[PDB]
Amino acid sequence: SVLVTGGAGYIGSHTVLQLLEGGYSAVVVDNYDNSSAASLQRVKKLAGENGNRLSFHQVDLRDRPALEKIFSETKFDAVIHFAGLKAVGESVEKPLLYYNNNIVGTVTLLEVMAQYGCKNLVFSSSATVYGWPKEVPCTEESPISATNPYGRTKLFIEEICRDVHRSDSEWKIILLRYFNPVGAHPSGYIGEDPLGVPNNLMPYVQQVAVGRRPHLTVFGTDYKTKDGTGVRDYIHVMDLADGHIAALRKLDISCEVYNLGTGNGTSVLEMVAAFEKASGKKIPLVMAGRRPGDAEVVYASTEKAERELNWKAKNGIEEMCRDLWNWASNNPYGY
């Protein structure tokens, strides 16, 4: 039995499927800022027998009363905290919005959790907490520093979780530092459907592929990388979902960080070419300047996760691209 904040969205939807298919119950709260209820309807159907163990509500985490209402009806062995804004670039323009949504929402959540005595937390952290790492790959023990508000909200929240742990050892906390999840369920029945203009690379590429967007703008061509463009560790969202069930087993340790990545670094152009390969479509590119807040090279050391959580990323880039295209092809306009 779990509470999934942000469960209508990209990673949480997929993860809810896995929870259901692992025999878990799940309550979702989401305010549909960057998702819709249609994603969870589908997940309900696709999970088949086990769909009646999913329930979901439109709730903002900053709305303490409505969130308290949730915690009063059901009890949770755990909370998976997906909810928040996630765009580096946006956050530089709109820092207050990021600090508002992410910190106020998280703090509200953590306080409600204490009040109703649920103190097991799995948190969506981000590789962004490594800033511009001087050394790669990025280990869980390497310096944490951020270079933009979004990264800061994740670093600060990690720091808040540490302090709560230190304050009270009833808490069991796992900080999952996701790198760059891409792809879709292999059925193509569910996948990434961001609302408003997209910010992440691959959902922007999928929209270019079906004509919903005219070009991908490439943020930077003068980086110290193989091809001048940014490098990241892209990991299939279905692998990431399975990393959550792993983290839940692990909880039964106090306050632990685990990277979730593949351990390979892929450039932007590489990912585009891998997408063109999987889709047969051509993605027009605009080479522009760097996006304020972006790191250069960032990829995971996956070894702590591999050994501690007994979890590996299985899918490679071609699998990520095939599943993504399969979703996009069969759902060009989303849910």
Ligand X SMILES: NC(=O)c1ccc[n+]([C@@H]2O[C@H](COP(=O)([O-])OP(=O)(O)OC[C@H]3O[C@@H](n4cnc5c(N)ncnc54)[C@H](O)[C@@H]3O)[C@@H](O)[C@H]2O)c1
Ligand Y SMILES: O=c1ccn([C@@H]2O[C@H](COP(=O)(O)OP(=O)(O)O)[C@@H](O)[C@H]2O)c(=O)[nH]1
229 phi, psi to nearest 5 deg:
-105, 165
- Closest Cα to residue 196, out of 179, 213, 176, 221? 213
Interaction of residue 12 with ligand X, rule CB under 6 A? yes
Interactions with ligand Y, residue window 252-271 (CB under 6 A)? 268
Which pair of tokens denotes residue 226?
A: 């193989």
Distance CA 121, CA 272 (A): 35
Interaction of residue 3 with ligand Y, rule CB under 6 A? no
Distance CA 286, CA 296 (A): 19
> 40 vs 146, which CB is nearer to a second copy?
146
Q: Say which of 24, 98, 130, 150 is annotated catalytic.
A: 150
Interaction of residue 50 with ligand Y, rule CB under 6 A? no
Question: What's the min distance (Å) between Cβ of 323 and ligand X?
Answer: 15
Cα–Cα–Cα angle for 232, 205, 320, rounded to 5 degrees: 60
Distance CA 64, CA 290 (A): 38
**Which residue sits closest to ligand X, CB atoms considered?**
9
287 phi, psi to nearest 5 deg:
-80, 115
The binder of a second copy chosen from 58, 69, 104, 254 (CB under 8 A) = 104
> 86 vs 165, which CB is nearer to ligand X?
86
Stretch that binds ligand Y, among 34-42, 115-123, 197-205, 235-243 (CB under 6 A): 197-205
Binding residue count for ligand Y, defined by CB under 6 A: 16
In sequence order, the 6+-apart residues with CB closer than 8 A to the CB of 306 are: 312
266-267 and 285-288: which strand pairing? unpaired
Question: What's the min distance (Å) between Cβ of 84 and ligand X?
Answer: 4
Site string for a second copy, 107-146 (x = CB under 8 A): xx-xx--x--------------------------------
Stretch that binds ligand X, among 27-35, 205-213, 273-281, 293-301 (CB under 6 A): 27-35
150 as an active site residue: the answer is: yes
Question: What's the min distance (Å) between Cβ of 289 and ligand X?
Answer: 21
In 3-state terms, what secondary structure has residue 218? Answer: strand
CB of 255 closer than 8 Å to CB of 173: yes
Question: What's the min distance (Å) between Cβ of 281 and ligand X?
Answer: 22
CB of 335 closer than 8 Å to CB of 296: no
CB of 81 closer than 8 Å to CB of 106: yes
The binder of ligand Y chosen from 157, 291, 301, 334 (CB under 6 A) = 291
The binder of ligand X chosen from 86, 165, 185, 244 (CB under 6 A) = 86
Interactions with ligand X, residue window 116-145 (CB under 6 A)? 124, 126
Distance CA 88, CA 95 (A): 10
Interaction of residue 262 with ligand X, rule CB under 6 A? no
Distance CA 91, CA 161 (A): 22
Q: Which does 217 bind (CB under 5 to 8 A by kind): a second copy, ligand X, ligand Y, none?
A: ligand Y
Interactions with a second copy, residue window 162-201 (CB under 8 A)? 163-164, 166-167
Residues marked as catalytic: 150
